[model samples]
Target: QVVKPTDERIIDPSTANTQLTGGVCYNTTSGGNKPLAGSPYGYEFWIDTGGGVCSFCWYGADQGGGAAFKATWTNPHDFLGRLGYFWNENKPYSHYENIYCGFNYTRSGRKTAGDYSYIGIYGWSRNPSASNSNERLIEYYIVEDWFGNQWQADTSPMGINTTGGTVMGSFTVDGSSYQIIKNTRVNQPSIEGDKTFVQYFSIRQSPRKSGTISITEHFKKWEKLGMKLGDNMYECKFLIEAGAGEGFFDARLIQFYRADNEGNILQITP
Candidate 1:
């Protein structure tokens, strides 16, 4: 379901409060520059807009070489009131201001590996102190994934179908649950057929884990959302459509997710 912000807030780029770093590597290359294998590897990106937004992308190989993407919005009050400045203010303060942050991550794979991918979104408020506070807000997660050779997920219709050899995987919102639809093609023109082969799935929160939970659970959580069985999946497809031949690892939309209000699924147009 879609989740909306609880309060109205301003997005002041001048007073932003975050930092980020990014890098990519592949198997053909080495030492942070190698080509990624199994799934897209050594591919990463980060963006810290300082109190505005912090975004990141990574590959979930163990979980089927799927891609993982996350974005967070920090509370301005924490950076401004406590930290004493927006982006770079001359004013000084004794303590860092308290802030609220929201985060979401979505990944996909194949069903044989398990029909699911790991997925979760959370919200929290921090006072910038060593001590913990009860200002934190909590929300549960439900996510899913889909796959295809050349088909594209009908982000608008929330379904998967094939026009030719191309395959497409689509994910839809279903309240606390998620649905993953897949489409694939047989032997066909590599150009006219589905150009990109895809394997889609999802994960969900594991029922067994207690307390803070574990990474395995995190992986499982994504799977449950995607409605898959194992932890990974595979796909083969061309990277570029008409230009020079590009490998799958080089050109692909590894992961994606949506943020919406409670009790409603967010609609993503194709």
Candidate 2:
């Protein structure tokens, strides 16, 4: 009973295959920024009780718009979706960086000639999607990976789809600066029939950033680097990807949740 954000046509769980966010929608995958809404990349999200917000708005110039969103989380042990910070640019994208409102940037001009971009904050999960690396991703990179593309760099610790995951290096919590990678899954082919799990990454070796990341301390820092969590623990996304079709990264999303996980920080007065 999800997919219901009317205005005319709204349904993007990151790319709008059209089925759109199986459960707790918030998808927007741009090509050349073909969104006719209010903010950057025709957005969505507003379910607040503890967490859920894709607030900030502003996507003026075109030619480059990737704008990512994840947290469909059909179910992650009763987990909602969305985090904090990307309420970032006015509220975000990049092939060359210059789009403000946070960190992790690089590149030189016209989206770096070869053209490849990155904007961070990611924590993935999967058990039944499809083909290779069944699913289980981890990342915490403020900025890195311009176009080297393999595991994505600049900060460190990355593992997607799976087969090689075990970096385990660097530390720093609540203050920032991290580097830990633990991976698993041997076969990898999805539809859920024969899925695999175990992925933990706490990458982030730059400005000690944070837009929203505390899934119980990202599973208590992947349970100190042994890794484990998957009984359908899907959903947890914050993205901004670009490949230079043009380039725009100004994630300035604001307002959404205050805090409530036995920590308490909820505030909304009017």
Candidate 3:
């Protein structure tokens, strides 16, 4: 279920709030340098805009990743509207990303090149935050990746891209089938020219305009297939990406709950 926002109001990402540091920001006008700045090592919330996107990072295991991600976006139209976890491309994501919570809905929107109404994840890598900006991109997805670019949970063979590489497979959880993919791309004009780690995306096969699921539930099945989500996830944000479409996306990260290799569960709320 989409966890409702708490009884507090956070300043827009452009302003300074008690939860963030001054002079550090993760948002820009349509596109600029975004500060993966928040509670340093904890979870917090903020809203932003760009070509119109609200993106950034997260982490703080000693405490717990706070606030399930959430967003409600209605672009005066659409031009790559996205609000999801834009992690610090410090490392590559492996099969071990065993936990996830996501949902997508649109009353009426048009998309030409994206997996609409699906939940997904992405990962990238670089030597530094600003070495050319365009880096290699390695990623995967379950529902839809306009980039790794898959239409169905179709378990196809891994394809090679001059700019990147890709492979796919299928899995089942709670009796439901899902598509799992691994993708990678390198120094290209696409991602502004940066090194990228093969990302993993877990998208729903039974696409629903809206629905919710627990990340922990998925960790169980993927592991059996050797999908190991190494204990190194740093941050997460509910994301939305609009591309030449029309309408709005109201996202809510209601919960960020999960157990490590240990049987411990944590819930973060804003």
Candidate 4:
């Protein structure tokens, strides 16, 4: 059964103690900029399993205030194991409370300033009390940020969990197609000084085909890089094998196209 914040508190000291210990809870404002603000941040609890294997559940509710709901959970054995994401109306929210549990489990080192080594699991499982107990299991991963904000990996492809499928090919801005040599995802070091959480798109093209391909020629203000669709000029282009043959290419501009008059033309040669 889904338990809301205002739902008459059911105090099972045994269960409460087990779950509340090392467990954390948070509440974000409805449509608010910061979802982890207010009394919800830094609040943790634990769940005492009574030294046995018992399943427990918890939920977040609106509490009859706004359109959003705050979540509470009974701490799991390993916080990293419980990391995951949540779906609020279709939009995915990141959660890192599980990482806090990891700290408790290890009981050795303290979480660093910008450490994101923590991980967690999350998803919608079968609601035993519900008519359709067999529900979709949407798993997730959680990473703690330097600001103490729990970032969730729920989106597909490069989401937090990293259980997606493989990539066959990739196209560059210059319209260059490259064979995907190895498409893997890992927690790599980031130049931004923050932990890099990204999907590595590796491609391989023949060296003979390694020439600069001209992409989108059109160049407009709104079309430069950040404005709306029409706000920029400059046709997005990918540079594949300029002289021909084949080469691997990958870039963010692969999705955008520069205007014809703006010089956004992908020139492939040979």
Question: Whose lDDT is greatest here?
Answer: 3
Cand. 1 TM to true fold: 0.22
Task: After superposing candidate 4 on the true structure, give the runs of residues whose Cα lies further than 4 Å from its correct spot.
Answer: 1-165, 170-176, 180-185, 194-196, 200-204, 214-270
Ranking by TM-score: 3, 2, 1, 4
TM-score of 2: 0.26
lDDT by residue (140-159, candidate 1, tens digit) is 12222222123333121222
Scored by lDDT, model 3 comes in at 0.35
Question: What TM-score does structure 3 among the candidates reach?
Answer: 0.48
For residues 1-270, write the lDDT of model 3, one tens digit per residue: 223222122212222112311222233233422333343223222223233443332322221123322222333222322333445544433322334443433323333323333234323233333233222232333343232234333222222331123335666663356665444444423333344444555555454433445454444444454444443333343444443323333322222333334434332223
Quote the lDDT for 80 in model 2. Answer: 18
TM-score-better candidate, 1 vs 2: 2
Candidate 4 Cα RMSD (Å): 23.1
Cα-based lDDT at residue 245, candidate 1: 14
Q: Kindly list the per-residue Cα lDDT of model 4 for residues 1-270, writing each as its tens digit.
A: 211111122121122211122222332212211222322211121222222221211122211111111222222231111211122322211111101111111111222211122221122211123232121111112111111113422111122232243443444422334322222223432212223122222222221111222221111111232211221111111111111111111111111111232233221110
Count of clashes, each model: 68, 25, 56, 51
Task: For residues 1-270, write the lDDT of model 2, one tens digit per residue.
Answer: 112112222112223222112222333322211333333323323221222222223322221123323332211121212232232221011111111222222222233212233344443433333234433432233322222233444234333322156677656644466666666555443223345644455555453222433334445455555454433333323444333232222332312222333334332101
185: Cα error in model 4, Å: 4.8
Cα error of candidate 1 at position 64, Å:
20
For each candidate, give its TM-score against the true structure: 0.22, 0.26, 0.48, 0.18
